[PDB]
């Protein structure tokens, strides 16, 4: 059954790869953990992060008719004025990003928020995997970004 144990596992490991990519309409959702993408002890991206960052480069670039609004959100980081300043400092990290991988500054909307409406209990270590994670909205749209701090 060792080998039962192990294979599960693995399938896990080779389900997907962590980030979950819907459609709804005509537009696109991406949902992707921070934990898993952005260190532990501060909000600085990993290279698995920047990977995906790098697939969203790919479609916008593409897509000039389009814009990425990104609106992320952590509660078990800190205090909400804080998680703010971790979001925000995600949100220019994901900007940064974009604009390395040849993205037009003015087709990317990022703002950092901090918790508002969770996912999940904070009060389960499930419920904090759900919640440490980030929303990346594209539709169509000729309307250059706006500024968020």
Do not use: C, W
């Given at each position: 059954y060792y080998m039962d144990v192990q294979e599960a596992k693995l399938?896990?490991?080779?389900?997907?790869?962590?980030?979950?990519?819907?459609?709804?309409?005509?537009?696109?959702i991406?949902?992707?953990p921070n934990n898993v993408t952005f260190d532990s002890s501060s909000?600085?991206?990993?290279?698995?992060?920047?990977?995906?960052?790098t697939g969203v480069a790919m479609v916008l670039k593409e897509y000039p008719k389009t814009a990425v609004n990104v609106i992320g959100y952590t509660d078990s980081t800190g205090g909400h004025?804080?998680?703010m300043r971790l979001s925000q400092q995600r949100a220019d990290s994901v900007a940064s990003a974009l604009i390395t991988?040849?993205?037009d500054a003015s087709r990317i909307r990022t703002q950092g928020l901090g918790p508002a409406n969770p996912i999940a209990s904070n009060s389960t270590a499930e419920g904090k995997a759900q919640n440490r994670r980030v929303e990346i909205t594209l539709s169509p749209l000729l309307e250059h970004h706006h500024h968020h701090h």
């Amino acid at each position: 059954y060792y080998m039962d144990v192990q294979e599960a596992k693995l399938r896990d490991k080779m389900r997907g790869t962590g980030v979950s990519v819907t459609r709804s309409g005509d537009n696109i959702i991406l949902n992707m953990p921070n934990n898993v993408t952005f260190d532990s002890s501060s909000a600085t991206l990993k290279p698995a992060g920047a990977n995906t960052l790098t697939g969203v480069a790919m479609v916008l670039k593409e897509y000039p008719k389009t814009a990425v609004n990104v609106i992320g959100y952590t509660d078990s980081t800190g205090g909400h004025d804080l998680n703010m300043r971790l979001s925000q400092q995600r949100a220019d990290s994901v900007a940064s990003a974009l604009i390395t991988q040849g993205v037009d500054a003015s087709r990317i909307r990022t703002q950092g928020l901090g918790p508002a409406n969770p996912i999940a209990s904070n009060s389960t270590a499930e419920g904090k995997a759900q919640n440490r994670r980030v929303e990346i909205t594209l539709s169509p749209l000729l309307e250059h970004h706006h500024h968020h701090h």
